Every structure is written in structure tokens, then in C-alpha cells.
């Protein structure tokens, strides 16, 4: 299904957006999470929906840990990843 590409596109879109801040250090962990989600999905591990769930949960958690403040656009993509991870 095209669900795989859908997931990859959401992950890369978010990676792009997260690099638009004044610094990148506070976002590196989240970028690592996305790179890993992309690798796992590219290598067909579990399902794209499962990888999206993990990416979303890990980013939501890190946002607490690194006190991250996402933009409307970033939150929109994150919500889309959460949605995909539910259906």
C-alpha cells in the first residue's frame, strides 16, 4: 500500500520543518527519532503505522524532556502522524 510512502513523507516533512528554528541542538534528539523511524520503515520493520506510533510517542515524550515548542505547521504534521498511526 501507499501507506508506507505516506509515513515516510510525513517523517521527512517534519524533519525539514524542525530545521527552521534559530538553533538545532534542542531538536537533534527528535531528528534522531525521525531518522530511525525512516530507517525502520524503509527496511520494512513491523508496519508503517506502528513506526508512526513510535515516532509520535517518542517525540511527544521528548518535547516534555527537552521543553520543545513546536509551530502550528509542525503540530499539524505531528497530528497527521498520530492519525496515520491510528488508521
Residue numbers in the entry: 7 to 93
Sentences from the paper on this structure:
In general, type IIa bacteriocins are coexpressed with cognate immunity proteins (pediocin-like immunity proteins) composed of 88~115 amino acids, in order to protect the organism from the antimicrobial activity of its own bacteriocin.
A final model for native PedB was refined subsequently to 1.6 Å resolution against native data. The native PedB crystals contain one molecule in the asymmetric unit. They are arranged so that α1 and α3 run in the same direction and α2 and α4 in the opposite direction, forming an antiparallel four-helix bundle. The relative disposition of the four helices of PedB is maintained mainly by a network of hydrophobic interactions in the core of the molecule: Phe17, Leu20, and Leu24 from α1 (residues 9–26), Leu48 from α2 (residues 31–49), Val61 and Ile65 from α3 (residues 55–72), Leu74 and Phe76 from the loop between α3 and α4, Leu84 and Ile87 from α4 (residues 80–92) form a hydrophobic core. The C-terminal end of PedB (residues 94–112) that is thought to be important for immunity has no electron density, suggesting that this region is flexible. As expected, the structure of PedB is well-superimposed to that of EntA-im with r.m.s.d. of 1.3 Å for all Cα atoms.
